Amino acid sequence: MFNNEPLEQIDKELHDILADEEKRQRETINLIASENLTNGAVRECLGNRVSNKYSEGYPKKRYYGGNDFIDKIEELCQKRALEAFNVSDEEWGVNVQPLSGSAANVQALYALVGVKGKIMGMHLCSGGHLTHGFFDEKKKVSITSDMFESKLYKCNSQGYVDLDAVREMALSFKPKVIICGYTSYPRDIDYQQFRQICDEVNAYLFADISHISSFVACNILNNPFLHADVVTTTTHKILRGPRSALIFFNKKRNPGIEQKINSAVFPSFQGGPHNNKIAAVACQLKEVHSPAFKEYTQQVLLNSKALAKALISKQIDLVTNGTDNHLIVVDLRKFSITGSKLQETCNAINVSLNKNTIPSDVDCVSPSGVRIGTPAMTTRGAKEKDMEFIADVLARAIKITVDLQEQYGKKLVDFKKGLPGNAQLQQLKQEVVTWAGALPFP
Amino acid sequence: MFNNEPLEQIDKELHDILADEEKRQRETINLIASENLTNGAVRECLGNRVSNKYSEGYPKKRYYGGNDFIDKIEELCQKRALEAFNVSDEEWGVNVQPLSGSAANVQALYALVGVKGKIMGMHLCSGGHLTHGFFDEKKKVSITSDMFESKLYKCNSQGYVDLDAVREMALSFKPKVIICGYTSYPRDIDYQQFRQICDEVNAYLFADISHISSFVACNILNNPFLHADVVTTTTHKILRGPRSALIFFNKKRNPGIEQKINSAVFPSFQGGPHNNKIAAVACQLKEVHSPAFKEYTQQVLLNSKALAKALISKQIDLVTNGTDNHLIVVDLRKFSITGSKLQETCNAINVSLNKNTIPSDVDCVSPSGVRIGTPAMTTRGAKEKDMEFIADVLARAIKITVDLQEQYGKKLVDFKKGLPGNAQLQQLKQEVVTWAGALPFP
Ligand SMILES: Cc1ccccc1-c1cc(C(F)(F)F)cc([C@@]2(C(C)C)C(C#N)=C(N)Oc3n[nH]c(C)c32)c1
Ligand SMILES: Cc1ccccc1-c1cc(C(F)(F)F)cc([C@@]2(C(C)C)C(C#N)=C(N)Oc3n[nH]c(C)c32)c1
Ligand SMILES: Cc1ncc(COP(=O)(O)O)c(CNCC(=O)O)c1O
Ligand SMILES: Cc1ncc(COP(=O)(O)O)c(CNCC(=O)O)c1O
Ligand SMILES: [Cl-]
Numbered sequence: 001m002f003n004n005e006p007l008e009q010i011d012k013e014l015h016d017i018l019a020d021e022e023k024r025q026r027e028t029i030n031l032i033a034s035e036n037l038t039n040g041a042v043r044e045c046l047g048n049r050v051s052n053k054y055s056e057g058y059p060k061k062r063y064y065g066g067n068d069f070i071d072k073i074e075e076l077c078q079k080r081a082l083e084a085f086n087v088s089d090e091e092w093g094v095n096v097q098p099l100s101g102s103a104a105n106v107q108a109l110y111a112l113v114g115v116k117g118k119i120m121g122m123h124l125c126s127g128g129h130l131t132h133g134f135f136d137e138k139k140k141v142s143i144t145s146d147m148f149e150s151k152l153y154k155c156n157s158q159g160y161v162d163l164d165a166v167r168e169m170a171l172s173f174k175p176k177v178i179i180c181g182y183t184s185y186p187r188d189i190d191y192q193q194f195r196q197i198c199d200e201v202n203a204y205l206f207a208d209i210s211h212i213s214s215f216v217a218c219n220i221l222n223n224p225f226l227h228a229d230v231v232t233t234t235t236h237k238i239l240r241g242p243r244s245a246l247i248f249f250n251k252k253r254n255p256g257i258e259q260k261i262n263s264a265v266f267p268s269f270q271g272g273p274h275n276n277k278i279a280a281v282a283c284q285l286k287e288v289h290s291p292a293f294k295e296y297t298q299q300v301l302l303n304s305k306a307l308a309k310a311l312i313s314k315q316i317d318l319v320t321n322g323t324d325n326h327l328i329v330v331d332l333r334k335f336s337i338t339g340s341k342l343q344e345t346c347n348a349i350n351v352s353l354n355k356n357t358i359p360s361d362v363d364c365v366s367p368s369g370v371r372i373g374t375p376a377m378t379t380r381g382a383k384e385k386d387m388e389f390i391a392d393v394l395a396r397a398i399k400i401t402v403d404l405q406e407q408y409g410k411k412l413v414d415f416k417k418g419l420p421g422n423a424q425l426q427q428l429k430q431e432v433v434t435w436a437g438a439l440p441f442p
Numbered sequence: 443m444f445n446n447e448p449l450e451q452i453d454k455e456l457h458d459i460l461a462d463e464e465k466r467q468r469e470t471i472n473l474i475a476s477e478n479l480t481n482g483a484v485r486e487c488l489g490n491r492v493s494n495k496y497s498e499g500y501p502k503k504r505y506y507g508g509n510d511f512i513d514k515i516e517e518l519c520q521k522r523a524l525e526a527f528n529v530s531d532e533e534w535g536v537n538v539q540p541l542s543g544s545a546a547n548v549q550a551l552y553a554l555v556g557v558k559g560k561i562m563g564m565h566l567c568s569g570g571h572l573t574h575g576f577f578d579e580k581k582k583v584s585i586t587s588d589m590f591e592s593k594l595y596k597c598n599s600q601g602y603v604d605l606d607a608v609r610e611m612a613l614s615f616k617p618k619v620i621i622c623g624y625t626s627y628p629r630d631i632d633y634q635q636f637r638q639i640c641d642e643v644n645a646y647l648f649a650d651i652s653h654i655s656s657f658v659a660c661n662i663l664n665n666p667f668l669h670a671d672v673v674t675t676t677t678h679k680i681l682r683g684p685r686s687a688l689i690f691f692n693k694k695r696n697p698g699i700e701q702k703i704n705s706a707v708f709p710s711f712q713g714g715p716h717n718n719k720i721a722a723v724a725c726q727l728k729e730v731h732s733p734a735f736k737e738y739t740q741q742v743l744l745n746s747k748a749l750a751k752a753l754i755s756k757q758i759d760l761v762t763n764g765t766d767n768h769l770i771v772v773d774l775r776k777f778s779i780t781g782s783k784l785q786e787t788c789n790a791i792n793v794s795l796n797k798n799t800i801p802s803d804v805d806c807v808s809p810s811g812v813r814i815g816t817p818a819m820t821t822r823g824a825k826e827k828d829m830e831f832i833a834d835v836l837a838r839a840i841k842i843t844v845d846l847q848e849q850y851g852k853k854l855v856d857f858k859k860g861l862p863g864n865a866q867l868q869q870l871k872q873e874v875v876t877w878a879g880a881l882p883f884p
Binding site for chain 2: 001002003004005006007010011013014017018020021022024025028032034035036037038039040041043044045046047048049050051052053054063064065066068069070072073076099100101102103106110114115129130131141142143146147236240242243267268269270271272274276279282283286287292295296299343344346347350352354355378379380381440442
């Protein structure tokens with residue numbers, strides 16, 4: 001007693017937008033540092049009937065029977081996660097149930113410290129995530145700043161983590177967790193150094209590697225597994241998986257953490273796992289382990305360096321004047337145009353990037369930059385030679401933005417009126433579209 | 443630079459288990475009250491490239507641009523949700539970003555009362571959800587018991603909500619919110635009488651209708667919208683959508699609740715929404731509104747009535763001696779067997795049901811019943827006449843379970859040994875498989 005008509009027939013209204021979304025993805029130069037493109041295999045999993053099943057609990061300790069095939073899929077995913085991040089299944093545990101990154105971080109933090117618990121993370125302005133204890137004078141913006149007591153550590157005026165300030169803070173604050181690994185940070189992390197500060201106060205070390213996961217797994221960048229009690233990561237960014245999260249816990253350093261973390265995920269915070277996610281994650285984790293995927297990850301940093309170099313060659317300033325990873329942050333103060341202005345201009349030319357704060361911005365009211373990343377375009381087959389063109393399109397967009405701000409004035413309302421119908425934007429869009437539309441598209 | 447090889451070729455190991463999973467679903471008599479089977483159109487959305495997009499925030503106020511098509515999908519879903527539940531968009535608002543039921547409830551409760559806030563809900567033992575404040579002497583099992591201060595009310599010895607006890611509690615406890623709507627409650631709710639108690643103590647009225655959603659939408663059962671400040675529902679159960687949740691809030695009764703709920707979902711708890719979920723939900727919400735779906739929902743209650751009656755005719759006791767909805771809870775005290783025992787037996791015969799507590803059970807350690815529901819089987823095409831057979835299979839399973847307990851004893855380990863190889867079970871299974879495999883399968 002159901003309607004099995006195909007999506008096109010069943011919902012022509014929704015099917016049209018999705019074809020449109022597909023086309024806009026197909027014709028966009030996507031510089032969002034957190035985005036990527038999933039293959040058909042990962043999307044077959046997300047559409048799989050395995051999402052029908054309720055399977056609260058863990059494998060072999062399931063509330064319901066008839067979870068025979070779900071247990072195999074959940075354990076195959078845990079196995080591949082541990083393998084991919086080069087961890088022994090004797091020494092490291094993994095939870096694959098968190099629905100997304102923010103959920104995983106809140107669950108993992110609660111496990112360690114509980115309500116009223118003390119945490120330290122990077123400020124959102126300085127590169128840290130919302131789930132790293134972010135708050136404001138007006139409000140406790142994240143639950144992580146409200147259900148926990150959190151303190152926030154800034155990066156220096158050059159845009160690097162200042163360990164002296166972290167320790168200065170850690171000794172007076174005495175937290176149970178110190179969070180490292182960030183949302184918009186263009187350099188590698190000194191986890192070893194972090195591990196030393198946590199011991200000095202007996203705090204837990206929490207490494208959120210969602211933006212840099214593929215680097216860590218493929219050993220291009222520092223390994224937080226060597227020092228961290230917990231490693232959280234999303235699966236949908238550089239890893240190129242579905243939207244989900246992973247929590248890693250070091251049993252050897254902390255016996256009894258496995259149950260503490262597993263109970264935090266369920267039944268403290270979630271109900272039934274989403275099984276299509278789990279299957280999809282397993283499917284991507286097979287791909288992560290191959291030497292082919294390391295080739296892809298290498299390519300992301302190659303492109304990111306070439307992009308950074310090419311932007312400096314056009315006299316554009318970068319936070320920390322370069323990058324060790326997939327991402328860059330452009331400091332736009334040189335041109336006296338805000339980040340949101342450039343985001344609007346870039347969308348008009350089908351360039352997806354996002355506005356981003358910089359060290360000089362005391363206040364989040366106006367982000368003075370934009371953040372860009374190479375994983376999505378690396379996925380679409382772009383090589384080092386392609387980066388000069390991207391740098392060129394970005395340079396042209398900044399210039400156009402300066403022109404439109406001059407012509408229509410600095411107010412954002414005023415600026416936006418200038419955007420529609422601009423001949424140069426339409427010319428730039430066309431140029432963007434022709435080049436983007438041609439590239440391989442999973 | 444990606445692998446577009448199909449799932450079967452790319453990951454033969456995973457494809458085998460999913461092919462097995464598909465076969466088990468196809469040949470199982472699924473009585474799980476919370477399960478259903480999604481159609482192909484809902485699964486196409488779940489597999490759509492729309493999940494590639496990061497779109498934090500709300501429509502027309504995204505952090506990022508290039509969310510034009512995403513904004514249409516997110517607004518099309520909210521509209522259809524308000525349409526489907528017969529609420530005017532001026533009086534009622536809805537948030538469509540919660541990833542699942544448990545996340546939605548925690549988020550709504552936080553919005554209403556904050557950390558240390560006071561809540562009341564039904565005890566887990568009596569039919570309440572984990573996210574309704576559930577705790578135990580040994581541990582605060584849910585975050586709802588830990589991040590909030592919760593009080594738990596029980597149903598009477600006949601298995602009915604005791605409103606005197608709710609008021610007895612509410613006046614002494616003085617909560618800011620009172621939850622009603624339950625996980626395993628076989629009767630309808632007097633939402634009106636809840637409002638009367640809520641107004642008396644100036645507490646909010648929270649109705650969690652996840653199990654009964656379709657009934658509420660199609661006006662077959664009491665409409666909580668007339669009395670409630672907040673309504674939460676999952677989309678994956680009787681509503682037959684993907685795994686997601688909806689939060690409804692009443693603007694007229696509480697202006698400025700909209701921002702409170704919306705800020706709670708993001709950025710307080712979640713990060714990027716899962717757009718494939720929202721797309722998937724939009725697709726099911728269109729179907730919810732058709733009169734064909736009312737036909738199906740009506741059929742679910744007919745099958746449930748017929749099932750309760752056929753079970754009473756075989757001298758099987760039902761909690762409350764019947765049902766007003768999709769679910770029945772069987773009291774197995776008559777046969778001196780446990781619900782856990784009966785769950786094993788039923789999985790051995792490809793009958794999916796779950797163990798469930800009853801009013802007499804002091805503790806959830808040994809639940810004395812099982813819970814069944816008709817939505818899945820109703821979806822597969824089963825009619826009233828088909829119920830006698832399902833009631834026949836359940837009686838036979840209860841009988842076999844008594845025999846195996848006689849032969850191998852009451853210890854659970856001892857009992858399970860009896861399960862493999864049993865001729866009657868193998869006989870009962872084939873009977874189940876032959877009948878189940880024939881039915882329409884979306
Ligand atoms: C300040 C604030 C308060 C409440 C909700 C969101 C934000 C916010 C604002 C911005 C801004 F540029 F100012 F617009 C940027 C961000 C970033 C970036 C990546 C867009 C950000 C940054 N800078 C970091 N570190 O992390 C994130 N997590 N999610 C989002 C969306 C963000 C967040
Ligand atoms: C007691 C306990 C502590 C910690 C985690 C889970 C449970 C639990 C136990 C049972 C059992 F006793 F075994 F039948 C059942 C349940 C139910 C049913 C529907 C399986 C239940 C019930 N009775 C309610 N009301 O709600 C739920 N939400 N999630 C689960 C899984 C449940 C929960
Ligand atoms: C370090 C970090 N941690 C956690 C999350 C949470 O992910 P979910 O959106 O899945 O909750 C993000 C998202 N990062 C947003 C961005 O960089 O664009 C992140 O950057
Ligand atoms: C009343 C109620 N509320 C919230 C949830 C949470 O749903 P998620 O699993 O999507 O977190 C459930 C799940 N119901 C469990 C069952 O009936 O089997 C529920 O019954
Ligand atoms: Cl999903």
